[PDB]
GROMACS .gro file of C-alpha atoms in nm:
model
  444
    1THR     CA    1   1.154  -3.867  -2.709
    2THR     CA    2   1.061  -3.537  -2.583
    3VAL     CA    3   0.796  -3.339  -2.402
    4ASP     CA    4   0.719  -2.967  -2.421
    5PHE     CA    5   0.600  -2.750  -2.090
    6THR     CA    6   0.342  -2.484  -2.129
    7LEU     CA    7   0.334  -2.224  -1.859
    8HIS     CA    8   0.061  -2.008  -1.803
    9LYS     CA    9   0.149  -1.750  -1.551
   10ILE     CA   10  -0.136  -1.616  -1.338
   11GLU     CA   11  -0.191  -1.339  -1.041
   12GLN     CA   12  -0.269  -1.473  -0.705
   13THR     CA   13  -0.417  -1.264  -0.436
   14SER     CA   14  -0.488  -1.496  -0.153
   15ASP     CA   15  -0.396  -1.828  -0.012
   16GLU     CA   16  -0.459  -2.148  -0.230
   17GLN     CA   17  -0.289  -2.488  -0.329
   18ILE     CA   18  -0.411  -2.571  -0.701
   19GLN     CA   19  -0.283  -2.920  -0.756
   20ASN     CA   20  -0.153  -2.913  -1.099
   21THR     CA   21  -0.281  -3.226  -1.290
   22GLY     CA   22  -0.092  -3.171  -1.590
   23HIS     CA   23  -0.354  -3.091  -1.830
   24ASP     CA   24  -0.463  -2.773  -2.033
   25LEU     CA   25  -0.771  -2.626  -1.799
   26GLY     CA   26  -0.898  -2.391  -2.080
   27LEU     CA   27  -1.002  -2.071  -2.014
   28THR     CA   28  -0.979  -2.057  -1.620
   29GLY     CA   29  -1.058  -1.663  -1.586
   30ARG     CA   30  -0.763  -1.580  -1.432
   31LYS     CA   31  -0.562  -1.268  -1.463
   32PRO     CA   32  -0.240  -1.363  -1.658
   33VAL     CA   33   0.110  -1.189  -1.570
   34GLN     CA   34   0.330  -1.073  -1.851
   35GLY     CA   35   0.710  -1.049  -1.840
   36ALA     CA   36   0.784  -1.326  -1.632
   37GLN     CA   37   1.084  -1.489  -1.725
   38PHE     CA   38   1.138  -1.850  -1.622
   39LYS     CA   39   1.452  -2.069  -1.658
   40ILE     CA   40   1.454  -2.455  -1.693
   41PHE     CA   41   1.689  -2.720  -1.532
   42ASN     CA   42   1.718  -3.085  -1.559
   43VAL     CA   43   1.753  -3.197  -1.202
   44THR     CA   44   1.752  -3.582  -1.275
   45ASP     CA   45   2.088  -3.676  -1.167
   46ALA     CA   46   2.041  -3.446  -0.849
   47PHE     CA   47   1.696  -3.596  -0.774
   48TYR     CA   48   1.779  -3.951  -0.808
   49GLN     CA   49   2.105  -3.879  -0.576
   50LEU     CA   50   1.883  -3.765  -0.330
   51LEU     CA   51   1.636  -4.009  -0.350
   52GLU     CA   52   1.883  -4.281  -0.206
   53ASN     CA   53   1.829  -4.148   0.133
   54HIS     CA   54   1.481  -3.940   0.093
   55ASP     CA   55   1.167  -4.010  -0.033
   56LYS     CA   56   1.032  -3.844  -0.351
   57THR     CA   57   0.810  -3.583  -0.171
   58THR     CA   58   1.116  -3.489   0.043
   59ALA     CA   59   1.369  -3.494  -0.219
   60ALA     CA   60   1.144  -3.249  -0.463
   61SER     CA   61   1.085  -3.046  -0.145
   62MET     CA   62   1.508  -3.004  -0.097
   63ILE     CA   63   1.511  -2.921  -0.425
   64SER     CA   64   1.254  -2.657  -0.421
   65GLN     CA   65   1.388  -2.488  -0.115
   66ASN     CA   66   1.745  -2.451  -0.229
   67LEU     CA   67   1.751  -2.480  -0.628
   68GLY     CA   68   2.068  -2.274  -0.633
   69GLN     CA   69   2.218  -2.546  -0.434
   70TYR     CA   70   2.151  -2.820  -0.706
   71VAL     CA   71   2.191  -2.597  -1.014
   72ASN     CA   72   2.382  -2.298  -1.163
   73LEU     CA   73   2.128  -2.040  -1.185
   74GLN     CA   74   2.343  -1.822  -1.367
   75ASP     CA   75   2.411  -2.046  -1.658
   76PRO     CA   76   2.378  -1.890  -2.003
   77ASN     CA   77   2.277  -2.227  -2.172
   78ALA     CA   78   2.017  -2.249  -1.968
   79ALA     CA   79   1.694  -2.234  -2.176
   80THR     CA   80   1.494  -1.939  -2.102
   81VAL     CA   81   1.133  -1.795  -2.184
   82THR     CA   82   0.955  -1.473  -2.101
   83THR     CA   83   0.573  -1.474  -2.049
   84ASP     CA   84   0.368  -1.318  -2.331
   85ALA     CA   85   0.042  -1.105  -2.288
   86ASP     CA   86  -0.187  -1.395  -2.195
   87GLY     CA   87   0.069  -1.542  -1.925
   88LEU     CA   88   0.192  -1.801  -2.187
   89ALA     CA   89   0.557  -1.928  -2.226
   90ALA     CA   90   0.679  -2.283  -2.352
   91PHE     CA   91   0.999  -2.467  -2.313
   92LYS     CA   92   1.002  -2.740  -2.595
   93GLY     CA   93   1.166  -3.058  -2.692
   94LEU     CA   94   1.297  -3.149  -2.347
   95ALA     CA   95   1.444  -3.496  -2.306
   96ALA     CA   96   1.178  -3.744  -2.163
   97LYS     CA   97   1.448  -3.941  -2.015
   98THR     CA   98   1.786  -3.831  -1.881
   99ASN     CA   99   2.050  -4.128  -1.813
  100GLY     CA  100   1.801  -4.386  -1.815
  101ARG     CA  101   1.564  -4.256  -1.561
  102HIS     CA  102   1.242  -4.075  -1.640
  103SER     CA  103   1.334  -3.693  -1.621
  104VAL     CA  104   1.305  -3.452  -1.380
  105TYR     CA  105   1.293  -3.066  -1.429
  106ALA     CA  106   1.300  -2.767  -1.213
  107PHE     CA  107   1.127  -2.440  -1.281
  108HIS     CA  108   1.289  -2.081  -1.156
  109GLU     CA  109   1.138  -1.767  -1.188
  110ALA     CA  110   1.433  -1.546  -1.278
  111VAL     CA  111   1.260  -1.210  -1.349
  112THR     CA  112   0.942  -1.122  -1.169
  113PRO     CA  113   0.740  -0.825  -1.302
  114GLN     CA  114   0.637  -0.526  -1.081
  115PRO     CA  115   0.460  -0.549  -0.846
  116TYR     CA  116   0.460  -0.938  -0.794
  117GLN     CA  117   0.643  -1.193  -0.585
  118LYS     CA  118   0.792  -1.519  -0.761
  119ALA     CA  119   0.619  -1.825  -0.819
  120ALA     CA  120   0.765  -2.101  -0.578
  121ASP     CA  121   1.054  -2.306  -0.752
  122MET     CA  122   0.850  -2.581  -0.916
  123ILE     CA  123   0.976  -2.936  -1.000
  124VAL     CA  124   0.807  -3.194  -1.242
  125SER     CA  125   0.910  -3.544  -1.248
  126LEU     CA  126   0.778  -3.748  -1.538
  127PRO     CA  127   0.595  -3.927  -1.706
  128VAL     CA  128   0.248  -3.759  -1.667
  129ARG     CA  129   0.047  -4.050  -1.792
  130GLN     CA  130  -0.248  -4.061  -2.014
  131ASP     CA  131  -0.499  -4.372  -1.956
  132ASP     CA  132   0.203  -4.016  -2.163
  133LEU     CA  133   0.140  -3.630  -2.219
  134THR     CA  134   0.357  -3.476  -2.465
  135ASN     CA  135   0.251  -3.112  -2.341
  136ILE     CA  136   0.249  -3.070  -1.979
  137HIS     CA  137   0.086  -2.776  -1.878
  138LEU     CA  138   0.171  -2.575  -1.572
  139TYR     CA  139   0.011  -2.274  -1.386
  140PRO     CA  140   0.256  -2.084  -1.172
  141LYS     CA  141   0.131  -1.811  -0.942
  142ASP     CA  142   0.270  -1.480  -0.882
  143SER     CA  143   0.160  -1.298  -0.568
  144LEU     CA  144   0.044  -0.954  -0.640
  145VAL     CA  145   0.147  -0.701  -0.359
  146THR     CA  146  -0.106  -0.459  -0.280
  147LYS     CA  147  -0.159  -0.144  -0.085
  148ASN     CA  148  -0.504   0.008  -0.019
  149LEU     CA  149  -0.683   0.277   0.200
  150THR     CA  150  -0.909   0.046   0.380
  151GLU     CA  151  -1.125   0.267   0.665
  152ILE     CA  152  -1.161   0.630   0.738
  153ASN     CA  153  -1.225   0.687   1.111
  154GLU     CA  154  -1.283   0.325   1.170
  155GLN     CA  155  -1.529   0.289   0.889
  156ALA     CA  156  -1.478   0.091   0.578
  157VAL     CA  157  -1.468   0.279   0.250
  158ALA     CA  158  -1.470   0.213  -0.110
  159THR     CA  159  -1.165   0.138  -0.263
  160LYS     CA  160  -1.057   0.437  -0.468
  161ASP     CA  161  -0.753   0.589  -0.614
  162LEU     CA  162  -0.817   0.922  -0.463
  163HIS     CA  163  -0.982   1.004  -0.126
  164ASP     CA  164  -1.119   1.318  -0.014
  165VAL     CA  165  -1.037   1.404   0.367
  166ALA     CA  166  -1.080   1.625   0.656
  167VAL     CA  167  -0.804   1.730   0.901
  168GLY     CA  168  -0.823   1.473   1.195
  169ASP     CA  169  -0.934   1.202   0.997
  170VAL     CA  170  -0.785   0.870   1.091
  171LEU     CA  171  -0.692   0.651   0.791
  172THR     CA  172  -0.662   0.293   0.799
  173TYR     CA  173  -0.412   0.134   0.512
  174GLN     CA  174  -0.343  -0.214   0.466
  175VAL     CA  175  -0.035  -0.336   0.281
  176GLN     CA  176  -0.040  -0.719   0.178
  177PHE     CA  177   0.262  -0.946   0.041
  178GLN     CA  178   0.340  -1.324   0.048
  179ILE     CA  179   0.575  -1.491   0.317
  180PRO     CA  180   0.825  -1.673   0.075
  181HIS     CA  181   0.759  -2.032   0.036
  182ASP     CA  182   1.146  -2.088   0.133
  183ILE     CA  183   1.138  -1.824   0.416
  184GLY     CA  184   1.268  -2.103   0.665
  185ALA     CA  185   1.527  -2.260   0.423
  186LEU     CA  186   1.937  -2.228   0.493
  187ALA     CA  187   2.161  -2.079   0.212
  188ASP     CA  188   2.259  -2.220  -0.100
  189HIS     CA  189   2.571  -2.438  -0.029
  190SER     CA  190   2.550  -2.310   0.357
  191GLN     CA  191   2.469  -2.545   0.656
  192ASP     CA  192   2.519  -2.284   0.920
  193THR     CA  193   2.362  -1.954   0.781
  194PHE     CA  194   2.017  -1.864   0.663
  195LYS     CA  195   1.861  -1.792   0.318
  196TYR     CA  196   1.647  -1.506   0.426
  197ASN     CA  197   1.834  -1.223   0.666
  198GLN     CA  198   1.562  -0.933   0.586
  199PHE     CA  199   1.205  -0.894   0.503
  200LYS     CA  200   1.178  -0.535   0.522
  201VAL     CA  201   0.846  -0.359   0.431
  202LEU     CA  202   0.892   0.026   0.411
  203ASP     CA  203   0.605   0.245   0.352
  204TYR     CA  204   0.641   0.619   0.342
  205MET     CA  205   0.486   0.945   0.201
  206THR     CA  206   0.735   1.222   0.051
  207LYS     CA  207   0.464   1.507   0.081
  208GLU     CA  208   0.336   1.630   0.420
  209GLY     CA  209  -0.009   1.552   0.553
  210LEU     CA  210  -0.019   1.245   0.770
  211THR     CA  211   0.137   1.202   1.097
  212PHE     CA  212   0.160   0.809   1.184
  213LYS     CA  213  -0.046   0.694   1.469
  214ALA     CA  214  -0.003   0.331   1.499
  215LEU     CA  215   0.068  -0.021   1.378
  216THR     CA  216  -0.255  -0.164   1.421
  217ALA     CA  217  -0.217  -0.534   1.318
  218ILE     CA  218  -0.020  -0.810   1.128
  219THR     CA  219  -0.246  -1.095   1.009
  220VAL     CA  220  -0.180  -1.416   0.831
  221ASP     CA  221  -0.436  -1.717   0.781
  222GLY     CA  222  -0.662  -1.519   1.025
  223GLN     CA  223  -0.411  -1.525   1.323
  224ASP     CA  224  -0.276  -1.192   1.479
  225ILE     CA  225   0.091  -1.231   1.484
  226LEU     CA  226   0.142  -0.869   1.596
  227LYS     CA  227   0.145  -0.984   1.954
  228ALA     CA  228   0.392  -1.257   1.920
  229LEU     CA  229   0.651  -1.069   1.674
  230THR     CA  230   0.644  -0.748   1.888
  231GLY     CA  231   0.980  -0.688   2.054
  232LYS     CA  232   1.163  -0.969   1.845
  233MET     CA  233   1.155  -0.760   1.511
  234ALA     CA  234   1.282  -0.422   1.409
  235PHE     CA  235   1.034  -0.142   1.369
  236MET     CA  236   1.045   0.242   1.362
  237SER     CA  237   0.789   0.510   1.256
  238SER     CA  238   0.835   0.880   1.142
  239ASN     CA  239   0.733   0.967   1.528
  240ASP     CA  240   1.070   0.808   1.646
  241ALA     CA  241   1.413   1.011   1.640
  242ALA     CA  242   1.608   0.772   1.433
  243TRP     CA  243   1.338   0.802   1.141
  244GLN     CA  244   1.542   1.110   1.037
  245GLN     CA  245   1.855   0.934   1.038
  246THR     CA  246   1.783   0.701   0.768
  247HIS     CA  247   1.517   0.871   0.587
  248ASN     CA  248   1.381   1.252   0.509
  249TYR     CA  249   1.030   1.165   0.439
  250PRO     CA  250   0.754   1.336   0.621
  251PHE     CA  251   0.576   1.030   0.696
  252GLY     CA  252   0.609   0.658   0.711
  253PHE     CA  253   0.766   0.329   0.890
  254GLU     CA  254   1.024   0.055   0.832
  255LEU     CA  255   0.935  -0.279   0.962
  256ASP     CA  256   1.210  -0.564   0.926
  257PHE     CA  257   1.080  -0.894   1.059
  258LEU     CA  258   1.442  -1.046   1.050
  259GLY     CA  259   1.603  -0.713   1.164
  260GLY     CA  260   1.526  -0.734   1.523
  261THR     CA  261   1.683  -0.868   1.825
  262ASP     CA  262   1.536  -1.237   1.773
  263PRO     CA  263   1.532  -1.279   1.381
  264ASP     CA  264   1.521  -1.675   1.408
  265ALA     CA  265   1.222  -1.661   1.641
  266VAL     CA  266   1.063  -1.487   1.366
  267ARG     CA  267   1.163  -1.682   1.078
  268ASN     CA  268   1.033  -2.001   1.302
  269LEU     CA  269   0.685  -1.832   1.309
  270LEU     CA  270   0.688  -1.738   0.950
  271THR     CA  271   0.798  -2.066   0.843
  272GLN     CA  272   0.454  -2.194   0.967
  273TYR     CA  273   0.289  -1.946   0.737
  274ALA     CA  274   0.530  -2.010   0.432
  275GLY     CA  275   0.334  -1.892   0.100
  276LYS     CA  276   0.074  -1.741   0.259
  277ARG     CA  277  -0.070  -1.374   0.237
  278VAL     CA  278   0.034  -1.137   0.527
  279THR     CA  279  -0.170  -0.809   0.598
  280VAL     CA  280   0.026  -0.544   0.773
  281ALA     CA  281  -0.230  -0.263   0.882
  282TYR     CA  282  -0.173   0.084   0.998
  283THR     CA  283  -0.326   0.406   1.090
  284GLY     CA  284  -0.249   0.785   1.010
  285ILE     CA  285  -0.392   1.108   1.117
  286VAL     CA  286  -0.448   1.379   0.867
  287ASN     CA  287  -0.275   1.722   1.008
  288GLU     CA  288  -0.247   2.085   0.979
  289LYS     CA  289   0.024   2.038   0.716
  290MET     CA  290  -0.240   1.870   0.483
  291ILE     CA  291  -0.304   2.153   0.234
  292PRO     CA  292  -0.527   2.200  -0.070
  293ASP     CA  293  -0.411   2.171  -0.445
  294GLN     CA  294  -0.195   1.860  -0.317
  295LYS     CA  295  -0.248   1.512  -0.404
  296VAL     CA  296  -0.047   1.304  -0.134
  297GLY     CA  297   0.016   0.929  -0.187
  298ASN     CA  298   0.249   0.685  -0.037
  299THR     CA  299   0.486   0.412  -0.154
  300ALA     CA  300   0.537   0.059   0.006
  301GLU     CA  301   0.844  -0.134  -0.073
  302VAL     CA  302   0.896  -0.475   0.004
  303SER     CA  303   1.257  -0.632  -0.004
  304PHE     CA  304   1.439  -0.929   0.099
  305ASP     CA  305   1.823  -0.790   0.033
  306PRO     CA  306   1.962  -0.451  -0.028
  307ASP     CA  307   1.980  -0.498  -0.397
  308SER     CA  308   1.601  -0.574  -0.507
  309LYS     CA  309   1.232  -0.424  -0.385
  310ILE     CA  310   0.879  -0.482  -0.484
  311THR     CA  311   0.740  -0.125  -0.502
  312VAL     CA  312   0.358  -0.020  -0.494
  313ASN     CA  313   0.188   0.261  -0.485
  314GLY     CA  314  -0.133   0.346  -0.238
  315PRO     CA  315  -0.420   0.609  -0.313
  316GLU     CA  316  -0.366   0.957  -0.295
  317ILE     CA  317  -0.547   1.163  -0.053
  318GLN     CA  318  -0.644   1.543  -0.097
  319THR     CA  319  -0.829   1.797   0.115
  320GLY     CA  320  -1.049   2.109   0.041
  321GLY     CA  321  -1.005   2.477   0.141
  322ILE     CA  322  -1.151   2.807   0.068
  323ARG     CA  323  -1.041   3.186   0.067
  324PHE     CA  324  -1.219   3.512   0.137
  325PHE     CA  325  -1.167   3.864   0.074
  326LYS     CA  326  -1.341   4.081   0.326
  327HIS     CA  327  -1.336   4.434   0.197
  328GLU     CA  328  -1.495   4.761   0.211
  329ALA     CA  329  -1.797   4.815  -0.024
  330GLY     CA  330  -1.657   4.993  -0.325
  331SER     CA  331  -1.301   4.927  -0.315
  332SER     CA  332  -1.026   4.668  -0.246
  333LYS     CA  333  -0.976   4.788   0.111
  334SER     CA  334  -0.876   4.475   0.320
  335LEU     CA  335  -1.107   4.482   0.664
  336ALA     CA  336  -0.939   4.339   0.981
  337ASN     CA  337  -1.178   4.192   1.261
  338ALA     CA  338  -1.483   4.126   1.072
  339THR     CA  339  -1.631   3.826   1.267
  340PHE     CA  340  -1.771   3.506   1.076
  341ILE     CA  341  -1.867   3.127   1.168
  342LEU     CA  342  -1.897   2.827   0.921
  343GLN     CA  343  -2.236   2.673   0.883
  344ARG     CA  344  -2.346   2.350   0.693
  345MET     CA  345  -2.684   2.205   0.644
  346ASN     CA  346  -2.696   1.835   0.781
  347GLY     CA  347  -3.047   1.752   0.659
  348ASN     CA  348  -3.241   2.030   0.750
  349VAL     CA  349  -3.045   2.146   1.026
  350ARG     CA  350  -2.790   2.388   1.049
  351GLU     CA  351  -2.453   2.263   1.227
  352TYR     CA  352  -2.157   2.532   1.285
  353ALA     CA  353  -1.788   2.467   1.281
  354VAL     CA  354  -1.561   2.427   1.582
  355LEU     CA  355  -1.204   2.440   1.515
  356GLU     CA  356  -0.916   2.270   1.712
  357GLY     CA  357  -0.586   2.428   1.748
  358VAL     CA  358  -0.628   2.770   1.656
  359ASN     CA  359  -0.596   2.998   1.934
  360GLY     CA  360  -0.343   3.259   1.808
  361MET     CA  361  -0.471   3.237   1.446
  362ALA     CA  362  -0.640   3.534   1.275
  363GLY     CA  363  -0.671   3.549   0.878
  364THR     CA  364  -0.559   3.195   0.781
  365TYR     CA  365  -0.718   2.921   0.984
  366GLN     CA  366  -0.538   2.547   0.954
  367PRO     CA  367  -0.695   2.358   1.219
  368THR     CA  368  -0.615   1.999   1.365
  369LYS     CA  369  -0.974   1.890   1.341
  370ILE     CA  370  -1.340   2.015   1.278
  371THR     CA  371  -1.638   1.929   1.475
  372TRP     CA  372  -1.994   2.046   1.425
  373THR     CA  373  -2.261   2.144   1.685
  374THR     CA  374  -2.606   2.283   1.692
  375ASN     CA  375  -2.520   2.502   1.963
  376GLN     CA  376  -2.421   2.840   1.748
  377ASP     CA  377  -2.263   3.024   2.015
  378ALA     CA  378  -2.013   2.726   2.074
  379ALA     CA  379  -1.902   2.773   1.697
  380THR     CA  380  -1.570   2.907   1.644
  381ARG     CA  381  -1.557   3.288   1.583
  382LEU     CA  382  -1.348   3.342   1.263
  383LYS     CA  383  -1.171   3.704   1.219
  384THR     CA  384  -1.043   3.850   0.915
  385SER     CA  385  -0.669   3.976   0.879
  386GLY     CA  386  -0.550   4.299   0.694
  387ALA     CA  387  -0.412   4.096   0.418
  388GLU     CA  388  -0.405   4.217   0.061
  389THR     CA  389  -0.545   3.936  -0.170
  390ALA     CA  390  -0.720   3.721   0.082
  391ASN     CA  391  -0.782   3.787   0.461
  392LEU     CA  392  -0.978   3.474   0.565
  393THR     CA  393  -0.878   3.105   0.468
  394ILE     CA  394  -0.981   2.787   0.601
  395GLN     CA  395  -0.855   2.438   0.505
  396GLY     CA  396  -0.913   2.069   0.609
  397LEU     CA  397  -1.257   2.067   0.481
  398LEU     CA  398  -1.476   1.802   0.314
  399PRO     CA  399  -1.623   1.911  -0.028
  400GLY     CA  400  -1.978   2.026  -0.031
  401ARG     CA  401  -2.224   2.317   0.026
  402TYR     CA  402  -2.153   2.533   0.340
  403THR     CA  403  -2.233   2.907   0.459
  404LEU     CA  404  -2.013   3.186   0.578
  405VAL     CA  405  -2.237   3.369   0.860
  406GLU     CA  406  -2.111   3.734   0.946
  407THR     CA  407  -2.187   3.748   1.300
  408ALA     CA  408  -2.016   4.095   1.343
  409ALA     CA  409  -1.914   4.371   1.113
  410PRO     CA  410  -1.538   4.531   1.172
  411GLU     CA  411  -1.562   4.848   1.380
  412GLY     CA  412  -1.673   5.150   1.193
  413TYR     CA  413  -1.888   4.923   0.918
  414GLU     CA  414  -2.247   4.747   0.889
  415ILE     CA  415  -2.279   4.405   0.749
  416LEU     CA  416  -2.437   4.414   0.414
  417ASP     CA  417  -2.444   4.002   0.319
  418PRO     CA  418  -2.482   3.800   0.661
  419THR     CA  419  -2.514   3.475   0.479
  420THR     CA  420  -2.281   3.377   0.224
  421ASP     CA  421  -2.323   3.041   0.080
  422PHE     CA  422  -2.033   2.886  -0.114
  423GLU     CA  423  -1.905   2.536  -0.219
  424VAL     CA  424  -1.572   2.359  -0.138
  425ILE     CA  425  -1.428   2.204  -0.435
  426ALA     CA  426  -1.265   1.852  -0.379
  427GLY     CA  427  -0.890   1.893  -0.328
  428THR     CA  428  -0.855   2.274  -0.409
  429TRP     CA  429  -0.897   2.604  -0.277
  430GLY     CA  430  -1.224   2.655  -0.489
  431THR     CA  431  -1.300   2.833  -0.805
  432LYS     CA  432  -1.197   3.161  -0.654
  433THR     CA  433  -1.154   3.389  -0.359
  434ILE     CA  434  -1.496   3.510  -0.252
  435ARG     CA  435  -1.517   3.872  -0.190
  436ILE     CA  436  -1.751   3.984   0.081
  437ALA     CA  437  -1.853   4.353   0.139
  438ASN     CA  438  -1.901   4.586   0.441
  439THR     CA  439  -2.062   4.924   0.402
  440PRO     CA  440  -1.900   5.212   0.604
  441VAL     CA  441  -2.096   5.405   0.857
  442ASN     CA  442  -2.078   5.770   0.874
  443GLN     CA  443  -2.040   5.799   1.257
  444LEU     CA  444  -2.083   6.124   1.398
   0.00000   0.00000   0.00000
């Protein structure tokens, strides 16, 4: 006689150990995972062979840690099923007994969909007994790899796929993933070498806009393991010289836990938290190369060998800007050296823009940071160039309502419109280049 195994693949986003009873748990309200491919293997002979020297929990553990040691995972006759849209996948008609013993079956996730890490290789030793079960329901868990932007200037923010930023903003990002359940295991059929020799986390942006600041924390099970790890693991950022040697990305970092000077101490630490969720957090600074009309996302790649990776995309960021064309009234003649300050309202209070890193700039202003002051004489005096289509541009601005205040006309002219109210449109240069006239004075 036989038994069926019904798998219900589900998403894991946290630490948990749901003891599989064997029963159907109805509608659990968990998110299913589609496209997971499972193989099944009869490990009965192998299990009872081990059961001579080790107890059942230990024997089961040994096969779980090193399943490829006990079965040929590459077998073409090994029954295979892929999980449907409801997470469902069934192996049917498996022998309930094998060479006179109650059968023991192993399950291996051969193909894990993006962006998930595999369910641990599970084993089921029969029977599962009724007060036996013919259909045994299992609930294998795929750990979702995530990347989120969590804070801006050390303040929490709503999780969005698109954020509006200002130059000088410090962005906190978090990449989350699972330490493998078999991280500490040795390689299949090798008593001296290890199973994992690479635990690489590669975060990068293809477009300019961020400067790497710091690796802020590495958390697991509410423990900051960054201190214990540091020096013993490989790490580099785009601020380092040897970044450019392997990658040509503007921004990023590559963190290998097992690529450092002391992989074995690291592996030992990781083994204490095997199966648990690690948060790697880091800060970046929005810089003068962050331009409008340009969404800029990052990508994180978790990999345990050269030939595969779990890839995930973080949110995009964008910044605002504005163009003005200061001209002679009644013509397209561009007027250099007209003077403005930038104003916004904060409640019913005028604040004025102070720009950092803009000595030497006239016409195009691309600051490293913008702060705001109620002292109007401290405001950065912006000057126009003689350029043809627009002779005053500002970028790195949050969207919203501003006023360009003309504080001095260019020589030979008088101010026509002192205040010029305008709007920064999120992520763009704005609807149009705003024209500002100055009237010439017939000097004698």
